[model samples]
Target: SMAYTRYVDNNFCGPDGYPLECIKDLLARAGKASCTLSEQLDFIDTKRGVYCCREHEHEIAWYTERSEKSYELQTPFEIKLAKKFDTFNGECPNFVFPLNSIIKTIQPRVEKKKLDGFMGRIRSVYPVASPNECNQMCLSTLMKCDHCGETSWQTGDFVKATCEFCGTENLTKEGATTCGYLPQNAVVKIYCPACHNSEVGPEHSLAEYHNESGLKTILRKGGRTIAFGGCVFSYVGCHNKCAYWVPRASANIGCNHTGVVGEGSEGLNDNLLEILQK
Candidate 1:
């Protein structure tokens, strides 16, 4: 309604929000500027401000003004790393003081052989579908994406295998290509653009798509519950004239209806193996 009367004439119109004596001098200058901007943004330049030195050697000139710590230690401690000297390098005595801020801890630059040669050139271009090698087991076990986040499970690069959002473990294979590259006039379909019908197979001897009236493909098999005991499966990327089909037996044979085309309306819960022979 005119953008709700211009969001109540832009944020509550008069006494315009926050005012109990400017909210107690903005919470006493945001609690001493959050302890000197969290010790100058935890150190090295929170836009610079933390510095105080009074007794240790007494005026050499004496100093004062400090506050910033709230925990955040992150493993190295000794006040993180400690550093600050430039002011009296000539005879050490006449110093006026006020320049301390140290709490060290700074390491995050990580190279690890340039991150293991950029994860071995991304495992020579997104490879790792497992042969083992992922034993991080937990530190937040990381990497996993399949049900529509497109495919994954090479399990390599320390279990941190790509695509949680376009981290890509694919491309140049141009999206799982290889059905022997289709086109022998090709004819193997399995429709269901959400029930477009035509999944046939109530035993047309197992219908190998003759002239392929239209079905696309995705049949999966190999033990129950998302192909348990068989590893995990689900694929869907055959566009253009079709033929991305990869079922070599389990739309639940003569079908006791093994969970809608081996988990089609999406629900195999992960282990998903594939093996539907025609």
Candidate 2:
């Protein structure tokens, strides 16, 4: 094809396509040049590079450099938090607000007094923004579109967001908003785009990302594998239109999968609960 010929002509990549190394270096390079960052974004360092697309190719894929840790004891570590803007500051880890070039964890940011369907469980929370002195709140923006043909978390308004690729946009805040702490210690369930794709569930490696060392169960109930217990890992984000999250009552909490707290996958995995009980 002409594009492939041009892809070859440009010397962009070899048979393996765009080097993940090239991608990571480019972003780090950009940060080095005259680009000062936002407070939320400044407090971040990166790890492996990721492609939202499974193939890990360029063009269609949303390539990103990812930060495995919430706050390293380094730069973004030593960055100061703006007093008024800092909600629950100095208490928990820093939340890198949504950025397209990097992948960070997302949490469900909700109103303090408006949680009826939520589990009402108290957990560690830091507010990114406060409304009427609503503390302990957290929030981030997410976008999904057919143009990118995928989903992503980006810094923007949740109620209405433009796609990163900018085609169709979403007007609702349901699955597009979130709040969070560190991924490994996250208090709620985390589902990848693949994990929540459909009722059939994800493939082995994907399922295992959330499941314990064993294949117990996943948050998506219609599926089963005993490998995914909806455990949170520092991988993919809470996709906006997850099959399980969209058609459920608690979806308003975004992709946090507001299943009963401490009861794995809405009671599907007694084993997961058993392990935690001991």
Candidate 3:
């Protein structure tokens, strides 16, 4: 009750005992300040004006006038890299800008290599430390003759069974290679538990659908339910429609005869492949 009194004494309490002005102001300031709502609240002293938090004191100082040291937040890694790239030569350009740009460029490359995606499939998957090296790696991947160990190519993938660099025909043991392409035969069958039928659905790429277990993993990771081929399988809510559904898989799955995927419960069928035909 004392806390409630203190909350009221602050002169901005809403009907529900929360500060309405701070809630509105914080929402407004969220666009201007890139910090979390709590962090923004820390800067605001209710009635005492603005002050930077202890962590941001040096970066954002305010007394007579507000001053910002830097617009962007600098990570420790960037700080370390900046020092290494600092050549201290008058001829050399500013190290921070170029160094930061280099990091930004390579980060996307690194992230692309880390994930399995369309771009990832187009390029030979490999590790890269820098942008120039990444470009070189991509070039090598593009030009390397599958038929023979030819590094130099006049033009890449110009003709089948021939390397422009080596002028070789069917030199590769496999004749030719499509390194970046995913297989057409890489397929998985979806079986909906909701349909209450033994008929397996149409085949989806293993690259796309993978397996029921993988889909279930996504569901467990707080993902919503996904529908496919007349059957609903992976879900974070109840499946009331599917008569054969059970509650053994995970509690997040709503199995209480109310199959839905919002705000409560979840579901998965370990026997999802039971309807599939070999």
> Evaluated with TM-score, which candidate comes out highest?
2
Reference-based TM-score of each model: 0.13, 0.19, 0.16
Scored against the true structure, residue 249 in model 2 reaches a CA lDDT of 12
lDDT of 2 by residue, 49-77 (tens): 22322334432111122222211111111
Report how far residue 182 has shifted in candidate 2, in Å: 18
Q: Which segments of candidate 2 are over 4 A away from where they belong?
A: 1-72, 81-122, 126-191, 198-278
Could you say which candidate leads in lDDT?
A: 2
lDDT of 1 by residue, 181-277 (tens): 1111112233323222256332222224322334222331211111111111122222222222222111221111212111121222112223332
- Deviation in Å, model 1, residue 46 alpha carbon: 24
Q: Which of the two candidates, 1 or 3, achieves a greater TM-score against the reference?
A: 3
Task: Give the candidate order by descending lDDT.
Answer: 2, 3, 1
What lDDT score goes with residue 271 in model 1? 20
